[PDB]
Amino acid sequence: AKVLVLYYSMYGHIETMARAVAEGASKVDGAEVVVKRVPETMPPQLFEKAGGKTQTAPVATPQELADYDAIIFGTPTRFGNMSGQMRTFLDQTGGLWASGALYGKLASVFSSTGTGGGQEQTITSTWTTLAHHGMVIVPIGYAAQELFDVSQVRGGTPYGATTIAGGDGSRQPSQEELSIARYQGEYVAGLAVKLNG
Amino acid sequence: AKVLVLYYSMYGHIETMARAVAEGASKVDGAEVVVKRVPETMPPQLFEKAGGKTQTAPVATPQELADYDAIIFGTPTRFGNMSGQMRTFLDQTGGLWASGALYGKLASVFSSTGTGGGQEQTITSTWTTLAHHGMVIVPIGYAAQELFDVSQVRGGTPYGATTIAGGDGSRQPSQEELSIARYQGEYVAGLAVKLNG
Amino acid sequence: AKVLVLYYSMYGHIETMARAVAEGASKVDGAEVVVKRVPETMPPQLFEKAGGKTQTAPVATPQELADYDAIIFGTPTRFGNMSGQMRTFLDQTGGLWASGALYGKLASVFSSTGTGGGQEQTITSTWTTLAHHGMVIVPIGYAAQELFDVSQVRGGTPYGATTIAGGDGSRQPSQEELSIARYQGEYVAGLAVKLNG
Amino acid sequence: AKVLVLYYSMYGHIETMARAVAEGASKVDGAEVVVKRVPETMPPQLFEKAGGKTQTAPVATPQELADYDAIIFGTPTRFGNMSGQMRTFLDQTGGLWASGALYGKLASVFSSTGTGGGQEQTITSTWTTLAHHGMVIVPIGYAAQELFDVSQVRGGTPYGATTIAGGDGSRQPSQEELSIARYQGEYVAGLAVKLNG
Ligand SMILES: Cc1cc2nc3c(=O)[nH]c(=O)nc-3n(C[C@H](O)[C@H](O)[C@H](O)COP(=O)(O)O)c2cc1C
Numbered sequence: 001a002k003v004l005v006l007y008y009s010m011y012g013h014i015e016t017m018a019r020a021v022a023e024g025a026s027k028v029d030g031a032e033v034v035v036k037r038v039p040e041t042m043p044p045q046l047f048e049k050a051g052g053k054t055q056t057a058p059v060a061t062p063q064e065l066a067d068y069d070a071i072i073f074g075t076p077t078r079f080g081n082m083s084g085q086m087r088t089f090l091d092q093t094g095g096l097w098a099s100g101a102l103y104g105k106l107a108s109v110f111s112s113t114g115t116g117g118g119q120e121q122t123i124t125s126t127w128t129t130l131a132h133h134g135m136v137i138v139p140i141g142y143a144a145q146e147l148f149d150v151s152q153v154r155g156g157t158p159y160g161a162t163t164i165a166g167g168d169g170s171r172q173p174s175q176e177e178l179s180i181a182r183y184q185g186e187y188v189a190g191l192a193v194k195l196n197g
Numbered sequence: 198a199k200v201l202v203l204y205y206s207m208y209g210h211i212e213t214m215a216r217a218v219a220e221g222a223s224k225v226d227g228a229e230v231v232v233k234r235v236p237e238t239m240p241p242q243l244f245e246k247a248g249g250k251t252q253t254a255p256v257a258t259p260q261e262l263a264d265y266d267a268i269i270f271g272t273p274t275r276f277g278n279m280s281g282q283m284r285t286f287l288d289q290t291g292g293l294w295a296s297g298a299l300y301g302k303l304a305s306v307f308s309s310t311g312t313g314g315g316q317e318q319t320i321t322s323t324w325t326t327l328a329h330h331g332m333v334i335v336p337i338g339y340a341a342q343e344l345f346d347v348s349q350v351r352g353g354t355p356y357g358a359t360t361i362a363g364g365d366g367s368r369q370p371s372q373e374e375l376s377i378a379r380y381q382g383e384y385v386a387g388l389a390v391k392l393n394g
Numbered sequence: 395a396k397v398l399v400l401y402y403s404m405y406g407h408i409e410t411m412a413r414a415v416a417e418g419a420s421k422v423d424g425a426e427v428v429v430k431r432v433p434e435t436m437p438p439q440l441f442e443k444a445g446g447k448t449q450t451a452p453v454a455t456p457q458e459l460a461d462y463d464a465i466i467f468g469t470p471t472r473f474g475n476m477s478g479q480m481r482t483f484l485d486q487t488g489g490l491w492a493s494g495a496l497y498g499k500l501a502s503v504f505s506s507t508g509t510g511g512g513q514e515q516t517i518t519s520t521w522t523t524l525a526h527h528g529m530v531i532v533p534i535g536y537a538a539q540e541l542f543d544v545s546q547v548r549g550g551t552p553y554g555a556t557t558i559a560g561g562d563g564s565r566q567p568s569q570e571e572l573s574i575a576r577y578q579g580e581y582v583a584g585l586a587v588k589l590n591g
Numbered sequence: 592a593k594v595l596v597l598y599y600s601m602y603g604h605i606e607t608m609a610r611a612v613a614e615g616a617s618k619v620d621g622a623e624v625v626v627k628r629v630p631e632t633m634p635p636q637l638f639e640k641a642g643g644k645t646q647t648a649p650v651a652t653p654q655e656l657a658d659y660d661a662i663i664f665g666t667p668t669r670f671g672n673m674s675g676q677m678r679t680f681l682d683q684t685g686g687l688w689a690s691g692a693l694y695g696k697l698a699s700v701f702s703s704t705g706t707g708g709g710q711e712q713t714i715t716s717t718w719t720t721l722a723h724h725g726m727v728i729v730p731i732g733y734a735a736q737e738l739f740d741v742s743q744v745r746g747g748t749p750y751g752a753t754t755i756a757g758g759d760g761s762r763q764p765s766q767e768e769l770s771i772a773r774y775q776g777e778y779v780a781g782l783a784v785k786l787n788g
Pocket residue numbers: 008009010011012013014015075076077078079080112113114115116117118165169681682683684685723
C-alpha cells in the first residue's frame with residue numbers, strides 16, 4: 001500500500017527516472033506513493049559550482065523508511081557502486097537494522113551512468129545492502145519489451161531500470177528508458193498491494 | 198503453496214541442508230513442499246570412483262520448475278560460483294524464460310563450501326540468474342539469531358544458509374547451520390503462501 | 395610471453411571476439427599466443443540441431459593452462475553467469491588449484507550477450523573463480539576510447555570487451571567492439587611480457 | 592616500489608590490519624611503504640560520543656594516490672559494501688580517472704565485519720571501482736595456509752584479508768588473520784617491485 005521512491009540525483013537524470021518510477025506505481029489502485037531524496041553530502045557551495053541541480057523532493061530521514069511497504073532506490077553510479085551520498089544514507093540505517101524495521105519489505109533499484117558501464121554492478125551491489133536488512137529483492141526480469149530493442153542505445157536491465165546520461169550529462173532519459181522505469185514502479189507497487197494490501 | 202527445494206550435492210552436505218530447508222518449509226500450513234536433485238553430470242564411473250554419494254531424491258526436469266510457486270536452490274560452490282551441474286541445469290531453462298514461466302515466482306539460495314571462501318559469491322551470482330527470469334529474490338537477513346554466534350565456526354549468511362564442509366569433506370552440518378536452513382525454508386514457504394497462497 | 399585465449403562459443407560471436415583478442419595480443423613483440431576452446435557439454439546431435447556452429451580451434455585440456463603466463467577467457471552469458479560449458483571446464487581445474495599451477499598468472503575476460511543484459515555480471519562473476527586460483531585480474535578500464543561512444547549500440551565495458559549478438563544471434567561484432575577486443579589482447583599480452591618477459 | 596596502504600577504520604580493527612599489511616609489504620626490498628587513512632566523515636562530536644578511535648596515520652588526499660605504484664585498500668563493511676567514508680573518498684577520484692592516473696597500477700583490498708557476513712561482497716564490490724580506473728586487481732588466492740584452518744573462527748578470503756570484529760567490536764585480529772594480512776602486503780609489494788620496480 002505504501003511505496004517510497006528514494007533517490008539521489010546530482011544533475012537530474014535519476015530525479016527524472018524517479019518521477020517515472022512514481023508514475024508507474026501511481027497506476028496501482030491502492031498504492032500510496034511518495035518521492036524523496038537522500039541528504040546531499042558534498043558541501044553546498046560545491047554543489048552549486050559543480051553543479052547541477054536543485055530538487056523539489058524533500059530530503060528523507062532514515063527513520064521514515066519503516067513507514068513503507070516497498071522502497072525503490074535510485075542512485076547514479078560512482079565507478080560501479082552506488083553514490084557516496086546514497087551510501088552515507090544507508091549507513092545511518094543501523095537503528096532500523098537492529099529493530100528489523102525493514103525486514104521483509106519489498107526493495108527494488110534503478111540507476112544512471114555513463115556511457116553505461118557499471119549500470120549492472122551498481123544495482124546488484126545495492127541489493128547486497130538491502131539483503132542485510134532482509135528486504136525482499138525485486139528485479140524486473142524481461143517483462144518490459146523495450147529491453148529487447150537493440151536498434152537505439154538504451155539503458156535498462158533485468159536488474160532494474162537504468163538511464164544513459166552521456167559522458168557529458170547532456171542525454172535525457174529516452175521514452176523507452178522511461179517506459180521501463182514506469183514498468184518497474186507499477187510492478188513493485190502491484191506486488192506491494194498484493195502483499196499488503 | 199508449492200515450494201520446490203532443488204539442489205545439487207556430490208558428498209551430501211547440500212543434501213542434508215536441503216532436507217533441513219524442507220523441514221522448515223513444512224512447518225507452514227498450506228505449503229506443499231517437494232525436494233528434488235539436478236542431474237549428475239559426471240559419468241557414473243568417475244562419480245563412483247570419487248564418491249558417493251547416492252541420493253534418494255528424484256531428479257528434476259527443467260520443465261517442472263514452472264509448476265512451483267517458490268523455488269529454493271542449493272549448490273556447493275565451485276571456486277565462488279554455483280556448481281557446473283546446477284549451471285548446466287539452469288542453462289536448460291530457455292523455454293521457461295521465453296514464456297515467462299518463472300516470472301514473479303519466489304526464489305532463494307543456499308550453499309556449501311570448503312573452508313568458507315566463496316560462500317557469499319555463490320549465493321549472490323546465483324541471484325543474478327534468477328533475476329533474469331524475473332524471480333523475486335529472497336534473502337534471509339539476520340532473523341536467524343545464530344548468525345550472531347561467532348563462538349564456533351559456522352556457515353550461514355544474510356544472503357542464505359550455508360554449511361562448512363571442511364577441506365576433507367569430513368564436517369557435518371552443525372545444529373546452528375541447520376537451524377538457519379530451517380529458518381530459510383520456513384520463511385520463504387510463509388511468503389509463498391502469502392503470495393499465492 | 396605465452397598468452398592463451400580460452401573461449402566458448404556456440405554461434406561464433408565469442409569465437410570472432412577471441413580471434414580479435416588474439417590479433418591484439420599478437421601485436422606484442424615477445425608474445426606467443428594460442429587460441430583454444432573448452433569442450434562442448436551438450437550432446438553432439440543437439441549441438442548441431444540447435445545449432446550453430448563448427449570451430450577451427452582445438453579443444454583445450456585443463457592441464458594445459460599451466461603452460462601460459464596469461465589466460466584470456468571468453469564466454470557468452472547464460473543469464474548473467476558464464477556458460478555451463480566454461481563452468482564445467484573450470485570445475486576440472488582442481489588439480490591445478492591444489493598445486494597452485496595458475497597462481498599469480500594474468501587473467502582477463504570478455505563476453506557476449508543478448509541484448510546486453512548480464513554482460514557485466516558475467517565478467518565479474520568469472521573473476522571470482524579466477525581469484526580462487528590467485529590469478530592476477532586485469533580489467534581494461536577506459537583506455538579504449540570507443541567505450542565513450544554512445545551514438546551506436548556498442549558492447550564493451552571497463553571489465554572487459556563484450557559483444558551484442560542481438561536477441562536473434564544475427565548481429566556480428568562491430569568494428570568498435572572488435573577494436574576494444576583487440577585492445578584487451580594487446581594490453582594483457584603487454585603486461586604479460588613486462589612480467590615475464 | 593611505492594606501496595600505499597589506504598584504509599578507513601572507526602574502531603581500529605582495520606587499523607590493526609593495515610599495520611599488518613604494511614608490515615608484510617616492508618619485508619620486500621625496494622618497496623617504500625606508507626600507511627594513510629581517509630577523512631572521517633562524521634562530525635567530531637558524534638565520533639567522540641560513539642568512539643574512539645583516534646588514529647596516528649596521516650589523512651590522505653585523493654590526489655596522492657597518483658604517486659603510488661600499488662594501493663592496498665582497507666574498509667569495514669557497511670551492510671556488504673565499502674564504508675561510506677571510503678566511498679565518499681573514492682568519489683573524489685574523478686580527476687585521477689580522467690587523466691588515467693591510476694591506470695594499470697596494482698590494487699588489492701582487505702576488510703572487516705561483524706560477524707563475517709558481507710566480508711566477501713565488500714572486497715568484490717570494491718574491485719568494481721578499481722576496475723573503472725583500470726587498476727590491475729590482485730586477489731590472494733590460497734597461498735596463505737591459514738585459509739584452510741576451520742578449527743577456530745577466522746577472517747580471511749581468497750579475495751583479500753579480513754578480520755572478524757564481533758557484534759560487540761570486542762574481538763581483536765587473531766594471529767592467523769594478521770598472518771594473512773601480512774601475506775597480502777608481502778605479495779602485492781613483491782608484484783609492485785616486479786612491475787615497476
Ligand atoms: C566521480 C564519479 C564517478 C563516476 N563513475 C562513472 C562510471 O565510471 N561509469 C559511468 O558510466 N559514469 C560514471 N559517472 C557518471 C554518473 O553516474 C552520472 O553523471 C550520473 O548518472 C548522472 O545522473 P544524475 O543526473 O542523477 O546525477 C561518474 C560520476 C562521478 C562524479
